[PDB]
Amino acid sequence: IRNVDYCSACGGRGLFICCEGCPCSFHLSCLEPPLTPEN
């Protein structure tokens, strides 16, 4: 379940929303809802 450090959509660093089904951690801005903590 070890989420890899770098981004799952571009390769950057920072805090990303974890995923359990896959260790994919996309940037909070690199989703396709473009969202800040709103939702």
């Binding site: 571009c10 950057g12 940037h27 690199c30 989703l31 396709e32 473009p34 969202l35 800040t36």
Partner: protein, 160 residues
């Protein structure tokens, strides 16, 4: 299926690559003209020339699918990741306008240039891919024919 013909002016795309990434800049994305205002131009450009019912039906289907397709792709896989925080900036200004009417045709041609690598992920038949790539390359040619008022002329060196 594998190939397009990007005419040797869109020297622009790779420049688009540099500024956003190295020579740090940005595109503020309330835009006029928008994508939807140019498809509906080229359509009206070419559809006056198609002869049979087959041609006009397939052209209409492709164009409607293209506005909707740019809509559904523009968010998740069409931005350089520096126009990403700014995408969040713009997503709060207009909440009641579809993404197919805020960007000029400079992201659309990114779609045009990366389309074949996406049709090499689906099991289309030869005539689907043939007519599709024919239409989008004709669109690229029409765009280089009129790039006066369509492409931007400056970049917005913006804060993070």
């Amino acid at each position: 299926k594998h190939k397009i013909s990007v005419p040797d002016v869109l020297l622009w795309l790779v420049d688009d690559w540099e500024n956003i990434t190295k020579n740090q800049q940005l595109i503020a994305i309330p835009r006029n003209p928008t994508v939807r205002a140019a498809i509906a131009a080229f359509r009206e450009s070419k559809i006056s020339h198609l002869n049979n019912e087959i041609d006009v039906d397939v052209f209409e289907q492709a164009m409607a699918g293209l506005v909707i397709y740019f809509n559904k792709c523009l968010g998740n896989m069409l931005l350089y990741r520096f126009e990403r925080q700014q995408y969040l900036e713009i997503r709060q200004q207009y909440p009641d306008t579809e993404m197919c009417d805020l960007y000029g045709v400079e992201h659309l041609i990114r779609l045009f240039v990366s389309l074949p690598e996406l049709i090499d992920r689906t099991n289309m038949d030869s005539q689907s891919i043939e007519c599709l790539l024919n239409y989008i390359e004709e669109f690229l040619k029409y765009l280089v024919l009129h790039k006066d008022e369509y492409f931007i002329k400056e970049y917005q060196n913006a804060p993070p």
